[PDB]
Every structure is written in structure tokens, then in C-alpha cells.
Amino acid sequence: GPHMATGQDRVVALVDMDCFFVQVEQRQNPHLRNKPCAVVQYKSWKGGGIIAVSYEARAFGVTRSMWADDAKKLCPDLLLAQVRESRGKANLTKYREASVEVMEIMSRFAVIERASIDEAYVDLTSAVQERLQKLQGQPISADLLPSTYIEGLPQGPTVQKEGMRKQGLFQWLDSLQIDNLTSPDLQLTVGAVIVEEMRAAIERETGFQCSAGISHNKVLAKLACGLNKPNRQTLVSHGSVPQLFSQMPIRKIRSLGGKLGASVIEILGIEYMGELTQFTESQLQSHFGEKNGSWLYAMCRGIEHDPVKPRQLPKTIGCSKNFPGKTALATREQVQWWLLQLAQELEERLTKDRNDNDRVATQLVVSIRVQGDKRLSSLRRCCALTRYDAHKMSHDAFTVIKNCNTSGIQTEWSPPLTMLFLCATKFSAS
Template sequence: MERGQERVVALVDMDCFYVQVEQRTNPELRGKPCAVVQYKTWQGGSIIAVSYEARAHGVTRGMKGVEARKKCPDLQLARIPEAHGKANLSKYREASAQVMGVMSRFGVIERASIDEAYLDLTAASQEHLRQVEDGWRVPAGLLKTTFVEGINQPHPAQGSGDMGDTAALKEEERRAGVQAWLDSLPPHCDQDGPELQLTAGALIVEQMRAAVAAETGYRCSAGISHNKALAKLCCGLNKPDRQTLLPLGSVPRLFDTLPIGKIRNLGGKLGETIAELLNIKYMGQLREFPESQLHAQFGEKTG
């Protein structure tokens, strides 16, 4: 796990991208429960994207429109246009190109899908650190949408509470975690230090996401860590419109309760096979097996 700490990698994921595109086309949909459907109109079509307002009512991808409206009567449905019997994704691809164009100014980009991209921020982070003086200190306000995974434990649940109380508590925990992380950074600017490089990467991603929002109107979430798998993993921890920094020291505790299928490339048959053959459920358990045994059981490349 300690290999590759010199790298800074981010995964940026557009929040409910198809919904956002439809909301930009029709601003009346903003702030309302809505979903995007495609193909057959039978039973309202098949839902492929759901706004967070609709998710709160139990609407999920894969539902039919009619079924979803039973859970959320006010649900607004937007339909993907068709051309020659196929879904016409032109406006979504154009929106994606706009977003990727902004992101490419901040790092080396690798598109993962229409609404996701990886960025190698290693060089950009190192250059950022080269330009600062010794004794570099980051104001916590510059990391205003950043969570640092594993730095502080959530407070115990205090009754049911309402959504406002929950959001305020989460924001309090976020700020405390960021400040604790910044306080833990070495007093001198060691450009090779993985903690400082990740922090510089998080600053760059904050700037990039703000630029995407300002120039395109689209919101996105991000994960920042040392490789693609960890960046992908932490990107989904604090959506929407937030980013999560995952330092190497926080990975073991996160893995202790993380199902194997949640890891990139282990969500299908391979993950099921690993869990069955090794009689385990969590990534933390997989960590207990020596690399030689994994190579012997699953082949050198996969192991």
C-alpha cells in the first residue's frame, strides 16, 4: 500500500449529470424531484438518472416512471431524445466536452465516461509546492468543500433530528476534520511529502470544481488520493458537490468496513469469486492474505 505515494490522482464525477443537463435546458426543474428516462414510453420509460430531491423519496435508477411516481407523485420526468431509434446523447456529450475542457487546464485528464474523468495532479501539485515558501500554511477556508477521510470520528447520533440539524452537524465535522488535517502537516514545506502533495492536490481540485461551476453551471464531486482505485472510492463518500481527500493512513480503517465489491474492478464476478474462495466480505480481511498467496490463487496479474 505504501507504493505510489508520490502520485496525486483525482476522480471527478458530475453529480446526477443527465439531470443537471436537463435542468440547465429547463431551469424550472431545478430544486424539484426529477428523473431522466429513455427509450420505451411504456410505464413512463426506464429511469437512468435521479435528482437528489427524488432520491429522498425512494426513487432509484432502473425504476419505471409510473412506479417512481407512486413513491414521489410530484416527480418530473425528462426524456432523452431519440434519433433513428437510438438514444440521441448529443446534448449530454456537448455538455461533457465543456466540462472536460475546463478540467484539462488543471491536470492531465483521462476520461472514464461521459460524466467522469481521472486527473493526474502529481506534476501540478509539485509545481504548486515549488512556488510556496517554507512554512507553508493553508487557510482552512480554501478547502471549503473538502472532507478528509479518517481524521475525525463522527459524533454519536443524537436522536432523530431534522435534516437541517444533520447537515449542520456534518458541516461542523467537516471543518473540524480539515483543521485537524492541516494542523497535522509538517511545519516545513517538504515537496516530496505525500501529505503536503495531497493537500496541494485538494486545493487544485477545489479551484477546478469552482471553475467548472462558474463556466458551465455544472456541479461535480471529487476524490483525491494516490491512485485511481482510492480516488474512485473516496469520490462517492460525501456527494453531492463535495470532495474527499483520502490519505494513505486512513485506508486501513476505511477498508475494515468496506465490502470487496465497492472497490473499482471488484464489483462483479471477480469480487464475488474472491469473497467466496477466501471466505471474506471486507477489504480489510483481504489485506491479511500475503501477496504470494493471492498470486498463487488468482494468477500473478490479478493477484
């Protein structure tokens, strides 16, 4: 009733760059623009592995993880851009720097939480309040929402996509009460106005297009973002939740895409998020734990309280390389040489980070995978990171893992290593 929380206290957005690495390469090489194209890493093995795909290529069925040779079978005219290779490994610097471009623009509008290389959450609550004070009861023109979809609309008593968009937007605005400055629906709408502005600035100043979700929390914002890709934004109101969730597979919600989501489905014998409303909070806690149970109880009602964390920079800086099948490292000289290569890229990135961001990493994490292990990581050890020196870091990394060697022979390494990973962590101000 009057004490039942509705989770409408915040305005939160999720900005998601469209086929990001592809856009980066297309900006650099105009020949790739408006073409079926993909970004690949390495080229020797089956033409290389695809890590990003343009929407033109997706129409042919091209997907991430697909080998370029196989993608060509579906899309013979597919164009390709290769990830830069340095010191024998893929180097993602161009995309990290492009990410910084976008993140710094978004930061002008509000505090952001860097979710990934090309996603950021935004808490627009305060900005919306300010903007509402300028409007002063003034209605919101549909012209201020040129790329916005209102989920669930149109509805009630045109066969084209854009036509439908406008009809929904019209119904939404027609029902708004611009008279109430505390109206959640109004707040969401102003949030979307600001996101239009943010997305316009991103495209103007970088050339990159993106999609966005606007709602009352991170999970709904994220879900909304994916509803109308690419180059569009979607508003998901609290009111839209029941119908939206009624046919929404549980795996579509952030954090429920893996084993937990599978267990929710199996244990409860349900398929859709909405079906969760029929269980008490205690019931959910009993199956999935105190934390998960509470989260699920609230989430299926469109309520979540995870805050947009003020963090624009990554917490860690890591370098990793796989050594599949026959290429698995089997000698001591091999292991040492590749640790050095990884350590050299790491030193380079750490030094840049220290100059730009006034901080120093204090811990070096070393991870390896042994041939046969199904897990991505077989072992993880840490040592002190006291100096940004590649030779020292590689030596220290070898030291902490050198006893993983079974070979009675000092020169041979067994079982062969199929993955090396160096990660700098635990930053302090400098």
C-alpha cells in the first residue's frame, strides 16, 4: 500500500556503443563504413577469430567467436579489420583509448560507472531535478526525443518501424503530468531528453553511435538498452514491468544468464521473470541464499538498489595470452620468453596509467592454465609489485609459478601451459 516501495527513486541510464570495435576501425578506414565487416584477431588459424560484427554482416548470420573462414561462407563479401599485434600478442590499446574518448564525454553530463570497455551507467537523478527546474511545468516536445522508444507502447484501440516509434512516444507524452516534479514517469522522460543530448555529443565529437536504456535502476536500464539496437534509446517505466517481464526469459536479466539463472528455472519450474512474483521472499532466499533471494524478490517487481558507482577508470590492468593445442608452452625458455612479452606490454600500460591517472599498482597477480584443465584458470598467485620494470615483473612471475612444473628436467615444462596472465592490482594514489 502506502508503505510499499516501488523502486522509482532514481533515474539511471546505460549507454552501450554499437558494435564498438567495428566502429573504431570504420572511423579510421572509411572503406569499411556501411559495409558488412568484422574485427578479427590473429589470421593464421582459420582466418582469425571474430570479436566484433557490423549490423550489415549480422544480417548474413555472422557472429562473434566465429572463425573468419567460416564467416566468409555465410558472407563472401565480408570485410575484415585485424586487431593490432605487438610482442606476439593481440594488443587492444586502440579500443581502450577510443573508450576513454567516450567515457570523458559522458562524464561531462554526470558521474559514470565504467561497466566495460564500451558500456557506462549514469545516475541522472540530480541532473533531471535541475533540468525540471528550467522547464517549469513546460511540456516536453517529442522533438526532444528523436530516437527514443517507450517500451510497451503503442497499445490499445502504420506498418512501418519509425511510425510505430512515434505513435508510442505520442501516447506516452499525451499521458504525462508535467505538473508534478516528483512524478517518476516525468523524471524518466527528462532523463531520456538528457541521454539524447549525451548520445548526440558522443556522435558529434567521436563519430561513434550508441544505444541507451533509461529506467529506475541498472538492471532495467541495461535490459532497456538492448530492446532497440542499434542507434536508438529505450525508456522502460515502472509501469511497463509486469507486461515486459511476463514473457521475458529469466536468462535475459543481468546476472541470471548463467548457472544461477538455470537453477532458478530448474528448481522453481518457471521460464519467465514475471513468474517469480508468486514466491515469497523467504521461499526465494531458501533456494538461492539470503542475498540472491532478496535481490530476486525485488527484481522481478522491477526493483533494484545497486548504486551507480563513481568509477571511470578500470580497477585492474591485465595482459593475457592463450596457447591452444600444439602451441602449448613446453620449455622453460618458452615460459620465460612469453612472461617477458606480457610483462613488457604491462609495463608500458602501467607507466601510461601512472602518468595519466596519478596512481600506482602495488600487487602483481600471476595466473596460468595447464593443459587438460577445463577451468579457464588453473592457478593464481600474487607477489609484490614495487617497480614498473618488465624484466623484474616477469622474473617475479616465474618465481611464483616455477614450482608448478612437474618435469624432473629443469629445462622442460610439464604439463604444458595453455595460458599466461599478468594483472596489476591494488592501486594507491601517487
